[PDB]
Design a protein around this ligand. Sequence first.
Ligand SMILES: *[C@@H]1O[C@H](CO)[C@@H](O[C@@H]2O[C@H](CO)[C@@H](O[C@@H]3O[C@H](CO[C@H]4O[C@H](CO)[C@@H](O)[C@H](O)[C@@H]4O)[C@@H](O)[C@H](O[C@H]4O[C@H](CO)[C@@H](O)[C@H](O)[C@@H]4O)[C@@H]3O)[C@H](O)[C@H]2NC(C)=O)[C@H](O)[C@H]1NC(C)=O
Ligand SMILES: *[C@@H]1O[C@H](CO)[C@@H](O[C@@H]2O[C@H](CO)[C@@H](O[C@@H]3O[C@H](CO[C@H]4O[C@H](CO)[C@@H](O)[C@H](O)[C@@H]4O)[C@@H](O)[C@H](O[C@H]4O[C@H](CO)[C@@H](O)[C@H](O)[C@@H]4O)[C@@H]3O)[C@H](O)[C@H]2NC(C)=O)[C@H](O)[C@H]1NC(C)=O
Ligand SMILES: *[C@@H]1O[C@H](CO)[C@@H](O[C@@H]2O[C@H](CO)[C@@H](O[C@@H]3O[C@H](CO)[C@@H](O)[C@H](O[C@H]4O[C@H](CO)[C@@H](O)[C@H](O)[C@@H]4O)[C@@H]3O)[C@H](O)[C@H]2NC(C)=O)[C@H](O)[C@H]1NC(C)=O
Ligand SMILES: *[C@@H]1O[C@H](CO)[C@@H](O[C@@H]2O[C@H](CO)[C@@H](O[C@@H]3O[C@H](CO)[C@@H](O)[C@H](O[C@H]4O[C@H](CO)[C@@H](O)[C@H](O)[C@@H]4O)[C@@H]3O)[C@H](O)[C@H]2NC(C)=O)[C@H](O)[C@H]1NC(C)=O
Ligand SMILES: *[C@@H]1O[C@H](CO)[C@@H](O[C@@H]2O[C@H](CO)[C@@H](O[C@@H]3O[C@H](CO[C@H]4O[C@H](CO)[C@@H](O)[C@H](O)[C@@H]4O)[C@@H](O)[C@H](O)[C@@H]3O)[C@H](O)[C@H]2NC(C)=O)[C@H](O)[C@H]1NC(C)=O
Ligand SMILES: *[C@@H]1O[C@H](CO)[C@@H](O[C@@H]2O[C@H](CO)[C@@H](O[C@@H]3O[C@H](CO[C@H]4O[C@H](CO)[C@@H](O)[C@H](O)[C@@H]4O)[C@@H](O)[C@H](O)[C@@H]3O)[C@H](O)[C@H]2NC(C)=O)[C@H](O)[C@H]1NC(C)=O
Ligand SMILES: *[C@@H]1O[C@H](CO)[C@@H](O[C@@H]2O[C@H](CO)[C@@H](O[C@@H]3O[C@H](CO)[C@@H](O)[C@H](O)[C@@H]3O)[C@H](O)[C@H]2NC(C)=O)[C@H](O)[C@H]1NC(C)=O
Ligand SMILES: *[C@@H]1O[C@H](CO)[C@@H](O[C@@H]2O[C@H](CO)[C@@H](O[C@@H]3O[C@H](CO)[C@@H](O)[C@H](O)[C@@H]3O)[C@H](O)[C@H]2NC(C)=O)[C@H](O)[C@H]1NC(C)=O
Ligand code: NAG
Ligand code: NAG
Ligand code: NAG
Ligand code: NAG
Ligand code: NAG
Ligand code: NAG
Ligand code: NAG
Ligand code: NAG
Ligand code: NAG
Ligand code: NAG
Ligand code: NAG
Lengths: 319, 318, 318, 172, 172, 171
Amino acid sequence: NSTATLCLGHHAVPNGTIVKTITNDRIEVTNATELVQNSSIGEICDSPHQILDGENCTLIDALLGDPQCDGFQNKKWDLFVERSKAYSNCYPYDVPDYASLRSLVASSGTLEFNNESFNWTGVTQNGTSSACIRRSNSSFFSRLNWLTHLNYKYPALNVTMPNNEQFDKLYIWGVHHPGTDKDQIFLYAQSSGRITVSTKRSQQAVIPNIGSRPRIRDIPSRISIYWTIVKPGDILLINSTGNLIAPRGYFKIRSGKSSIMRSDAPIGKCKSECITPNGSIPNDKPFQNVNRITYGACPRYVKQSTLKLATGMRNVPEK
Amino acid sequence: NSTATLCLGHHAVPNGTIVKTITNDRIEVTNATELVQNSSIGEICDSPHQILDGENCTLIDALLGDPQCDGFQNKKWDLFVERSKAYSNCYPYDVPDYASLRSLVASSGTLEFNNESFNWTGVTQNGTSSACIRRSNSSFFSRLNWLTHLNYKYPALNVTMPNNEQFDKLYIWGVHHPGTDKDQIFLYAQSSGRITVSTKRSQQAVIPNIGSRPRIRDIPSRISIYWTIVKPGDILLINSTGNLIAPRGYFKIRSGKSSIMRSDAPIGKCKSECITPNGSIPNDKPFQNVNRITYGACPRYVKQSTLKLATGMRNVPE
Amino acid sequence: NSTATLCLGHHAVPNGTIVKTITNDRIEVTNATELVQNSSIGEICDSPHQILDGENCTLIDALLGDPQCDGFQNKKWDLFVERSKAYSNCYPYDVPDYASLRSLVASSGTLEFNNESFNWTGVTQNGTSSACIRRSNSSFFSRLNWLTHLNYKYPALNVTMPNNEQFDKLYIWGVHHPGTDKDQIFLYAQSSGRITVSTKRSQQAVIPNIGSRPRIRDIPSRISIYWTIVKPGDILLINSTGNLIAPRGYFKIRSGKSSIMRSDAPIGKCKSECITPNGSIPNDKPFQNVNRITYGACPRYVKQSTLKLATGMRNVPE
Amino acid sequence: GIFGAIAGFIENGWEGMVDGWYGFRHQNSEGRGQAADLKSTQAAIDQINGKLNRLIGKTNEKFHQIEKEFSEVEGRIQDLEKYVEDTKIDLWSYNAELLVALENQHTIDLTDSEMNKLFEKTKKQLRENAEDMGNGCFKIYHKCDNACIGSIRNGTYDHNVYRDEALNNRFQ
Amino acid sequence: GIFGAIAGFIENGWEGMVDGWYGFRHQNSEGRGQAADLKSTQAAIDQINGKLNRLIGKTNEKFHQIEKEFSEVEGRIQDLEKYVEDTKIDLWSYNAELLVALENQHTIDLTDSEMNKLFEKTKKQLRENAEDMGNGCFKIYHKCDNACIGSIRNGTYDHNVYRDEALNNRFQ
Amino acid sequence: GIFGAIAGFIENGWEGMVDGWYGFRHQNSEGRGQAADLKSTQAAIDQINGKLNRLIGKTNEKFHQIEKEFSEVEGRIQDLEKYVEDTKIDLWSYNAELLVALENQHTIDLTDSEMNKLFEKTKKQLRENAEDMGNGCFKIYHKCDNACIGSIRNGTYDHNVYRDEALNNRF
Ligand SMILES: *[C@@H]1O[C@H](CO)[C@@H](O[C@@H]2O[C@H](CO)[C@@H](O[C@@H]3O[C@H](CO[C@H]4O[C@H](CO)[C@@H](O)[C@H](O)[C@@H]4O)[C@@H](O)[C@H](O[C@H]4O[C@H](CO)[C@@H](O)[C@H](O)[C@@H]4O)[C@@H]3O)[C@H](O)[C@H]2NC(C)=O)[C@H](O)[C@H]1NC(C)=O
Ligand SMILES: *[C@@H]1O[C@H](CO)[C@@H](O[C@@H]2O[C@H](CO)[C@@H](O[C@@H]3O[C@H](CO[C@H]4O[C@H](CO)[C@@H](O)[C@H](O)[C@@H]4O)[C@@H](O)[C@H](O[C@H]4O[C@H](CO)[C@@H](O)[C@H](O)[C@@H]4O)[C@@H]3O)[C@H](O)[C@H]2NC(C)=O)[C@H](O)[C@H]1NC(C)=O
Ligand SMILES: *[C@@H]1O[C@H](CO)[C@@H](O[C@@H]2O[C@H](CO)[C@@H](O[C@@H]3O[C@H](CO)[C@@H](O)[C@H](O[C@H]4O[C@H](CO)[C@@H](O)[C@H](O)[C@@H]4O)[C@@H]3O)[C@H](O)[C@H]2NC(C)=O)[C@H](O)[C@H]1NC(C)=O
Ligand SMILES: *[C@@H]1O[C@H](CO)[C@@H](O[C@@H]2O[C@H](CO)[C@@H](O[C@@H]3O[C@H](CO)[C@@H](O)[C@H](O[C@H]4O[C@H](CO)[C@@H](O)[C@H](O)[C@@H]4O)[C@@H]3O)[C@H](O)[C@H]2NC(C)=O)[C@H](O)[C@H]1NC(C)=O
Ligand SMILES: *[C@@H]1O[C@H](CO)[C@@H](O[C@@H]2O[C@H](CO)[C@@H](O[C@@H]3O[C@H](CO[C@H]4O[C@H](CO)[C@@H](O)[C@H](O)[C@@H]4O)[C@@H](O)[C@H](O)[C@@H]3O)[C@H](O)[C@H]2NC(C)=O)[C@H](O)[C@H]1NC(C)=O
Ligand SMILES: *[C@@H]1O[C@H](CO)[C@@H](O[C@@H]2O[C@H](CO)[C@@H](O[C@@H]3O[C@H](CO[C@H]4O[C@H](CO)[C@@H](O)[C@H](O)[C@@H]4O)[C@@H](O)[C@H](O)[C@@H]3O)[C@H](O)[C@H]2NC(C)=O)[C@H](O)[C@H]1NC(C)=O
Ligand SMILES: *[C@@H]1O[C@H](CO)[C@@H](O[C@@H]2O[C@H](CO)[C@@H](O[C@@H]3O[C@H](CO)[C@@H](O)[C@H](O)[C@@H]3O)[C@H](O)[C@H]2NC(C)=O)[C@H](O)[C@H]1NC(C)=O
Ligand SMILES: *[C@@H]1O[C@H](CO)[C@@H](O[C@@H]2O[C@H](CO)[C@@H](O[C@@H]3O[C@H](CO)[C@@H](O)[C@H](O)[C@@H]3O)[C@H](O)[C@H]2NC(C)=O)[C@H](O)[C@H]1NC(C)=O
Ligand SMILES: *[C@@H]1O[C@H](CO)[C@@H](O)[C@H](O)[C@H]1NC(C)=O
Ligand SMILES: *[C@@H]1O[C@H](CO)[C@@H](O)[C@H](O)[C@H]1NC(C)=O
Ligand SMILES: *[C@@H]1O[C@H](CO)[C@@H](O)[C@H](O)[C@H]1NC(C)=O
Ligand SMILES: *[C@@H]1O[C@H](CO)[C@@H](O)[C@H](O)[C@H]1NC(C)=O
Ligand SMILES: *[C@@H]1O[C@H](CO)[C@@H](O)[C@H](O)[C@H]1NC(C)=O
Ligand SMILES: *[C@@H]1O[C@H](CO)[C@@H](O)[C@H](O)[C@H]1NC(C)=O
Ligand SMILES: *[C@@H]1O[C@H](CO)[C@@H](O)[C@H](O)[C@H]1NC(C)=O
Ligand SMILES: *[C@@H]1O[C@H](CO)[C@@H](O)[C@H](O)[C@H]1NC(C)=O
Ligand SMILES: *[C@@H]1O[C@H](CO)[C@@H](O)[C@H](O)[C@H]1NC(C)=O
Ligand SMILES: *[C@@H]1O[C@H](CO)[C@@H](O)[C@H](O)[C@H]1NC(C)=O
Ligand SMILES: *[C@@H]1O[C@H](CO)[C@@H](O)[C@H](O)[C@H]1NC(C)=O
């Protein structure tokens, strides 16, 4: 009369990992995976997204034509990376809605300038300044045109540029605010010069303010930058008497996956579809803790540094 | 025999339905229901929400007085529907913070104009242009008064009007921008002007800008529309040296369920709490995939085309 | 006999609590706890946070130096409380982006004014008004200097103030809009006086509008308040030909746990990590139903009034 | 399937089970038969209905909201409005998927509980007069006609009536 | 009720037990009495306390936020500021509602599970010395003095001592 | 612990069970030994893998979003941008936390289920030939070689051939 015994049981591991459930803060299980990406490789991968590095240039500076940003002319990008070392080496400028312009150009993702010939009759063209030094001579923004008086007479300007090529045009333009009255007569030969740039749907009027300003690159005058968008079938109308920083052409605006990100991480050679200011990160986890700023297919940002999901059963040790 | 058998079992159907679980993406259950709305009627319902159709008119144009929009005077709505075929046939106008005014009038839900009595002494009222063609001859925005020189003079205007009523009043006024200096001299007999609209708590000052602009209806000149809100115990003061397009009174404002929707869908006879630009949809399912724009009692918008909820046990065949 | 009965049972309470499950909307359980706070002591606690009441003084008035607000000078706060019984009697003033500046100073949580000596040569300082009665005598905003003509002439002002301190400076200045042109000539000896305050990264230019406005304390004129932030390593440049309400110094801006809240509730001496406009609430429960505006370690507001969590088993009584 | 009833010992479902969701299929000397248990069926149906009512019929009212579509590019304000709506849709989309997945898993498991509850009720009813083969069936070691099978289904089974015959047929 | 113990075969709860959540009620030759199982009670209480310690006491600090009450109707910015807060409130309210419903469901299930675990533990402890009546009670087919019930409740019951007597009372 | 098997009556984990998650450890004539059940183990991995597949799935692809870091202090519009991002971050962090807690609890219970299921299947197989002590072990009252253990492990076990021997041994 023999007997036998048959026990049923599960496996166990020496130490295991600790997770959290609905009922307990700490519980030991055999295996668990991490759901939060807590690290970055340290560099921004140049694939699969197109990366343009501004280095010493900002997006607006490359848009305007800073003498250190002529290499960004007619350049497209998927993500524009701005460094915390960029500076301006041109005429001091102030864009009243800077963030909106930067977002506009970033979402456009292209800096594509097609030049147009405006009938600037009676005004001296291609103005120059000692703050903007292209090559080794005084210059100005490449995409900007500075008009001064001809024969000490600045005539009225009435220039029309329609849009018939079936794509929206982004026009840059500016208004010069001289630091002295004497400067205003020296360049524009008028007391004060009004500016009116209009389309069939929008109008913009700018009046210049003449007065001293803090000197950057030994220039007390400033220039205000404005942007105008013209639809296909609409005409751009510029009507002025002076203090006009004229467009040299039209910038193209597109609708795409493009944006701009601020970082100081090197553009290393790899492929990662998620870019972060701290560097590119891998999209193998649902969540992440690197940065709240993301581009591409990116894990969602959470405040928690650690979040483990058990890939095994409760670990009951033999001991 | 001395033996019986009694088996316990469950039901099964050939019309299975695959649903989603935590641990499985494809599991077959007996019965299931749909949680997301995928199709619309396609047309907006007149019930229960009051629907006003602008057809060829926008909310701002009706608020301003474009002649084709003159039928919307004194009208109210629970939801204003703006069509793609909308167009303007009055003076070329521009409203800074246009979206703010549009939302403000929409949340108001009323276009109630009661005319007031400004003195406007020394100027000619009821200006007209060859674009705002009401009746058959020339007119202007029915809600706006255009002031020009009387006896070739434009005396300075300083008018007052108190808010002695317990409802906040909304005033629409404007500034005229002539295309030429010769124009500005012709209309107002003066070289440019100023306008200042003031309350005991807010002040707005506008400057006319003379310059050539793209001609709409052969009019190179423009007018800029602004709004002022005057509350009870306050006074509206208008101080103009010229180029003022004056209000003709006050619009009443309200707070309520009213809004505005942009749609090109027809208007039908039905009752539906949910109104969308694509059309009215039933609100029985908890979610929807028609449009992120909804009005009234509506299911919430989700990005997934279907969300099937199981109403039965797992379906195993025989 | 050789028979025994051993029953296994559970505990039941005479009167349980009804809770809600995903399956049953109403099921009875033994013990339950509330997860939503719907009550308050009706008081604001000055612990652990630093609470500063405003009484008759708004945050902007204390920043500017309203005579009744002089007790708020050089004071700090974690939370600033604004009461509906707030009145200003210095001078009628309008702040472009009033809300932004209010958030500016609130987030700073400090009003630390350090005085500086600008040139102000050729102009008369310490201008006074009869609406700003400080100490039974006409005065002005404490932190703002009113600049008048001297010897019936107003020289052009061009004043530079550098920031070498290792922190940021906040400047509050103003522009005067006289009600009549005779007032403008009487004060500033010039028909029109421009203002331009500029840094190396900003430029603010203002041209005043002369015009009568609704009178508060018999003052038909208005001063428009502007603020300029000068970062460490920048300069503040003031360029004027008249109509200047200049700063008497700089305000120190800081970052921290500071903010502002509106509440007509008393501040007794208690301790609560959570503050709401209805009065400090406890933070034991994870949710609250008192107000959406919260400050500190606060439960999260929800639409629901009461949510019950089962702290016991299902109740079946005998 | 946490008890292993629908996909466990009971390997197959019955399509002829059209009078209910859970049922009894007996074979005896009087032939076969198939009957329905309505307590288990309703104890399920009410549970999923209670879910359905928690989900279906609850609706919010949103009258005036932000603009969600745009025609001209503006800048920071338009991008902020787009971002707020995008984050709202995605968060509710997650809530919908997690709702469906959690409730469907519960639906399967609650039907698992009901089937196992029926098996336990029958097994405790039969006491020592029957044995389970692990396929959802019970071997009744005493002759049971249609009447006493209905006594099983109706709850009126006196195990003492047939205890001796079943025990003799089980151990001898 | 996924195990069918609280609302099932044990269809009556005892208000007389005040020293524990689960317990025993015995009838023997010495009379009748009641006791409580502190271990299973403690396990259920600990699980509930773990739920509370995950919920109660967790506070989030927010100091400076957007304005949520506006006195003058501004328009676009005011509408947007209203919309974000309304969206946040709605999403958090749904999170709260789903939380309490799920937690109450799991609480009921866990209490049912603890009761079922005690029943199966007693069943496996009694082995073939007793049988299940299907109402939560066990019929012991041998003489149990009060120390016998104590041995079942303390964990020191030896079935091999009463096995022969119980088998004779069972199958004879 | 809901079924009370992993932390319940089987309150011991075998670190020597490196082949599978659950299984059988036997002692009979011809000696003691240890083996694994492959169906129950695979069922547990399949459920966990289904959880993992549903977790990452498709990752949200966002390209141009609002600004989230600011150098200068601007006021209302910047506070609005910060508040929007805070609210989104906190809501997603809460979703993260609840998902981790609930799924981890579900994993604990699914593993306890598969154990109790395997135990129930083995009981139903042994019929009246064996008895349960209450520790995941069965006392078999018929001589079982290292062969009929495999029969129990693989479904090819007939209780009718050991029925009389086990009954006589039991009573
Ligand atoms: C807001 O509202 C106020 C109040 O109406 C306006 O202020 C008026 O401004 C005008 C023009 O600047 C002033 O008109 C001038 O009046 C002078 C005489 O005024 C006296 O007589 C009148 C009665 O006729 C009294 O009401 C007044 O109080 C004085 O006692 C004239 O001599 C001036 O003439 C000059 O201009 C005309 C017009 O081209 C020329 O023909 C003349 O040759 C000369 O150049 C002038 O007409 C008026 O007095 C002011 N009223 C006041 C101060 O109460 C604001 O202009 C208005 N807008 C703004 C932006 O503030
Ligand atoms: C453009 O048009 C507007 C119309 O709204 C004019 O604004 C009004 O201007 C008049 C004055 O011209 C204002 O009327 C005066 O109001 C004073 C208010 O004073 C307050 O404070 C004092 C104490 O400081 C209190 O005593 C008083 O009760 C008030 O609380 C009154 O004091 C004035 O009365 C005195 O003067 C008049 C005139 O001499 C005498 O008849 C009286 O008896 C008394 O001595 C006077 O009533 C009026 O309030 C203004 N309205 C608004 C809404 O502001 C602009 O002036 C005008 N602009 C021009 C023409 O350029
Ligand atoms: C900001 O600060 C700057 C610097 O102080 C200041 O620029 C100055 O502007 C004034 C006004 O335009 C200039 O002063 C004038 O200069 C001319 C030329 O020298 C003189 O003819 C003027 O004479 C006045 O007085 C005469 C006698 O009554 C009158 O007949 C004549 O019409 C004038 O009224 C007067 O002195 C000054 O030269 C400049 N400073 C420079 C160029 O360095 C500016 O005005 C300030 N404000 C603003 C808003 O910019
Ligand atoms: C937008 O552009 C328009 C022009 O298209 C401009 O409006 C004015 O247009 C006229 C012609 O259409 C410009 O020409 C003037 O014509 C008159 C004759 O009527 C001349 O007298 C003017 O100056 C001459 O004479 C002066 C005195 O002898 C001299 O000082 C001068 O050098 C000339 O010899 C002039 O030729 C006119 O100039 C413009 N207006 C102005 C202010 O220039 C309109 O102004 C433009 N937009 C804006 C916002 O100003
Ligand atoms: C209003 O007041 C302002 C007070 O600052 C005036 O601005 C100053 O104007 C003077 C001329 O009168 C300038 O002086 C020249 O500056 C250049 C620049 O070099 C200096 O700055 C660079 C900056 O990097 C620094 O590296 C150098 O070491 C110098 O310190 C000098 O090269 C010249 O020699 C000369 O000093 C001031 O630079 C200028 N300062 C500012 C901050 O603008 C303004 O002109 C007045 N407006 C009027 C009177 O209308
Ligand atoms: C904490 O303090 C808060 C502010 O004092 C309290 O808020 C109050 O809450 C009560 C109860 O919900 C509200 O009473 C109802 O309000 C609704 C809304 O109507 C208002 O809005 C519509 C918008 O279209 C407008 O048309 C109406 O005229 C109203 O202005 C009414 O329909 C009801 O009849 C009823 O009045 C208060 O309105 C509300 N006060 C506010 C928002 O100022 C809050 O209850 C306090 N919490 C506590 C004490 O626990
Ligand atoms: C400044 O440049 C603009 C653009 O070239 C000029 O606008 C054009 O002005 C002429 C009249 O001088 C307009 O012709 C008129 O058109 C109307 C409508 O078709 C027609 O009914 C009249 O009989 C006349 O032919 C022309 O349409 C207009 N073009 C545009 C695009 O607006 C403007 O005249 C120039 N000068 C000034 C002072 O603005
Ligand atoms: C313009 O008005 C300001 C503000 O009232 C004047 O500054 C103030 O000047 C007084 C003295 O006239 C200062 O009070 C005294 O300060 C000294 C030194 O600390 C102390 O020993 C005395 O006991 C008394 O407290 C007062 O602090 C000062 N306020 C400031 C600087 O904010 C200014 O003098 C006036 N200028 C002119 C030209 O009238
Ligand atoms: C200014 O530069 C452009 C560049 O193409 C040229 O076309 C134009 O003739 C120049 N104008 C001058 C030199 O006056
Ligand atoms: C990423 O960088 C930000 C600052 O740009 C920092 O606050 C954050 O802690 C970093 N996250 C890391 C290193 O994971
Ligand atoms: C609206 O305009 C269309 C032309 O676009 C016209 O056919 C229709 O009759 C108009 N409806 C009105 C004016 O009610
Ligand atoms: C203003 O209008 C009122 C209307 O009754 C009139 O009595 C008064 O004389 C008017 N004032 C002027 C200055 O025309
Ligand atoms: C201007 O139109 C209004 C409209 O009600 C009318 O009362 C007034 O008499 C008109 N003025 C004229 C025609 O001069
Ligand atoms: C229910 O639980 C709470 C937890 O704080 C406790 O204070 C209360 O006494 C309990 N009620 C009962 C009846 O056990
Ligand atoms: C506020 O004003 C009231 C009168 O309106 C006065 O009684 C009270 O003392 C004032 N409080 C302060 C702090 O000035
Ligand atoms: C500023 O003050 C200095 C010193 O008193 C003086 O020399 C200079 O002229 C002043 N600047 C002016 C008056 O613009
Ligand atoms: C303050 O006001 C009183 C009013 O009675 C006046 O007499 C006194 O002169 C004023 N103070 C000074 C310093 O003048
Ligand atoms: C058993 O119950 C059924 C209803 O479920 C009834 O039709 C039948 O007559 C009953 N039979 C007995 C024997 O109780
Ligand atoms: C078992 O019950 C008996 C009752 O006589 C008691 O003496 C003993 O202490 C109990 N066991 C334990 C471990 O307490």
